Ligand binder design. Structure first.
Ligand SMILES: [Ca+2]
Ligand SMILES: [Ca+2]
Ligand SMILES: [Zn+2]
Ligand SMILES: [Zn+2]
Ligand SMILES: [Zn+2]
Ligand SMILES: [Zn+2]
Lengths: 381, 330
């Protein structure tokens, strides 16, 4: 018997709620998406709860779920994923944090200003060794060495962190950029807001070994590249992919198709749809879902569905009326060899409510894909 | 007493089609992004209509005689007359009108000259009958369609005791409409070609509803794309119609205006000509018993609450929704 490849596509924050300006439709329904409708037509639809009914999931916990893990048991914080995201190589005993440059006195800093402000801090010195690297805008990443055990900020690390903020401030309050900054009347980046303490996730085994496959992912956003790396994926970020409105989606598709030739399972992430939701811009979000449809249309023109099982959904809902992640289930579609196609015709939340897959959990998606790919092993007998 | 309403009938020439492979098995209308018509389908009611009868292809003129509530076979007396009426001429019972085409002879090698060049050529032909440049026509007291005075019972306006106006560009449809009692207009930009100005048609249409009780709006281009077998283009044209229709919805109160949308016949790309396939029809507004359809398309029309009707049942249904129908008996 022949096994098949897998293609899991995530349209970040896809799910939404009825929008009045869209005649009561959601951005996904309103948006012209002939390719996803074609796939929903020959495929099967369903609704998935990343975590559980009515429970909003952060981007990191939602993706652990999408990759096939139980977020409530594997999740050990965000920091570590962010650190792996910026390309660092950490040990399972390290503790990482997401850092925001702030202003303390008794700024929307530039991406290059944080890289410099970060450099000087690396070159700050306390009891334990640490890595401090900037990521994007006023953000940054802090890594405390073999301190995973104190991941719930414990007493020891908060004193280190507290010495680190005091010490960091000294370094910070002195950089020329800040120096130019107070002169230019701009709020200085002299304080450090540290949060999202995280260690390596408590997962039994990696994705690759669990399912015995080679797995690659086309991803731009740091946090998602981190989760993917933590579970064992070979992450790629093609030229042009920024995870923002100006991203090259056709470049992501081009790469996804390439990777299918050397990997068994490929994961593709598209982030911009989620930003439009956070900013309450229904039309824009719908416009972005349309760019994704064309991206998908490209992939479909270069792959055989009898050889590739395709799944498309969102890691979670991000309603424009909520301007943040919601607990609303997310539309899901699966098409390809092995699928028992239901009678749904288009891809949308109301249609998914009638799909043959029913209402499942986000961590059900990979197992069902793996089974359609004939890569599942029985339990018992 | 009881409030009467106005009616607005929109005809997208050749709207109907057949499933197209490159369009994933969908028709151009189903494939096209039409939020405004889908919205109207959702709040309205759908059905399919046979211009003349099941499996019977109808020309643009006979189909419109049907759509205006008449009987094709009893009223139709040739294409020429309507063509002549569409150019502003005033013909008499004993005249014989014709459709003329400026073509190249060498054997007829080519049957695209500029409008101004045709009138200039029309002027000199007439200088040394009535030959007139349209976008030509020959009236006798690449020519064809010998038509004579049309035999219609009575005018649309008298029949329904209403003031009717139409926003048309194509000569042929302007003729049929004038012939039935319509005050026909044609704003600047409206050309009946792919380059026409759908917005001018919609703008004029809204304005016309202020002084008229029934307004008819015709859109030609969709049909042209069907003839040349251009699926993607037909869809784009249909999308332009949806925008046009959107403007109108942003300026009229559906509770006072009964709106109907359909084609006068099917012009399937794979046929490059008129077919006898029933055309999708939608009706929305005051008095309508909304069914459970959610989009405007041939397949959804198959599930509409109006069922499969004739082209000549449309006006009667609109008029009854406008409370302008009259009981027979009692
Ligand atoms: Ca199906
Ligand atoms: Ca309805
Ligand atoms: Zn997300
Ligand atoms: Zn988000
Ligand atoms: Zn026609
Ligand atoms: Zn035609």
């Amino acid at each position: 018997v022949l096994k098949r490849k897998g293609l899991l596509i995530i349209l970040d924050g896809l799910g939404d709620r009825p929008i009045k300006e869209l005649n009561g439709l959601t951005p996904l329904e309103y948006a012209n998406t002939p390719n996803m409708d074609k796939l929903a037509e020959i495929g099967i639809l369903g609704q998935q709860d990343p975590i559980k009914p009515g429970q909003p999931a952060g981007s990191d916990t939602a993706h652990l779920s999408i990759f096939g893990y139980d977020p409530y048991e594997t999740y050990r914080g965000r920091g570590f994923f962010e650190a792996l995201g910026v390309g660092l190589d950490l040990s399972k005993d390290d503790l990482a944090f997401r850092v925001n440059f702030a202003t303390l006195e008794n700024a929307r800093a530039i991406q290059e200003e944080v890289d410099i402000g970060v450099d000087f801090i690396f070159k700050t010195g306390h009891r334990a060794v640490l890595v401090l690297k900037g990521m994007s805008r006023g953000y940054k990443v802090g890594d405390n060495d073999p301190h995973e055990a104190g991941k719930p900020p414990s007493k020891k690390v908060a004193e280190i962190l507290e010495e680190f903020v005091k010490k960091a401030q000294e370094v910070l309050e002195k950089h020329p950029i800040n120096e130019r900054r107070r002169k230019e009347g701009k709020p200085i980046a002299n304080y450090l807001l540290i949060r999202g303490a995280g260690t390596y996730p408590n997962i039994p085994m990696k994705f690759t070994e669990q399912w015995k496959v080679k797995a690659a992912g086309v991803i731009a956003v740091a946090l998602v590249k981190g989760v993917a790396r933590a579970v064992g994926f070979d992450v790629y970020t093609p030229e042009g992919a920024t995870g923002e409105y100006n991203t090259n989606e056709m470049a992501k598709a081009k790469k996804a198709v390439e990777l299918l030739k050397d990997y068994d399972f490929v994961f593709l992430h598209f982030k911009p749809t989620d930003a439009a939701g956070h900013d309450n811009k229904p039309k824009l979000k719908a416009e972005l879902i349309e760019r994704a449809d064309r991206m998908i249309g490209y992939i479909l023109d270069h792959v055989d569905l009898e050889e590739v099982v395709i799944a498309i959904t969102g890691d979670h809902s991000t309603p424009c009326e909520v301007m943040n992640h919601s607990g609303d289930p997310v539309p899901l579609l699966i098409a390809g060899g092995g699928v028992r196609t239901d009678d749904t015709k288009r891809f949308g939340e109301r249609e998914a409510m009638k799909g043959g897959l029913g209402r499942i959990r986000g961590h059900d998606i990979v197992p069902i894909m793996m089974d359609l790919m004939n890569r599942s092993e029985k339990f018992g007998a």
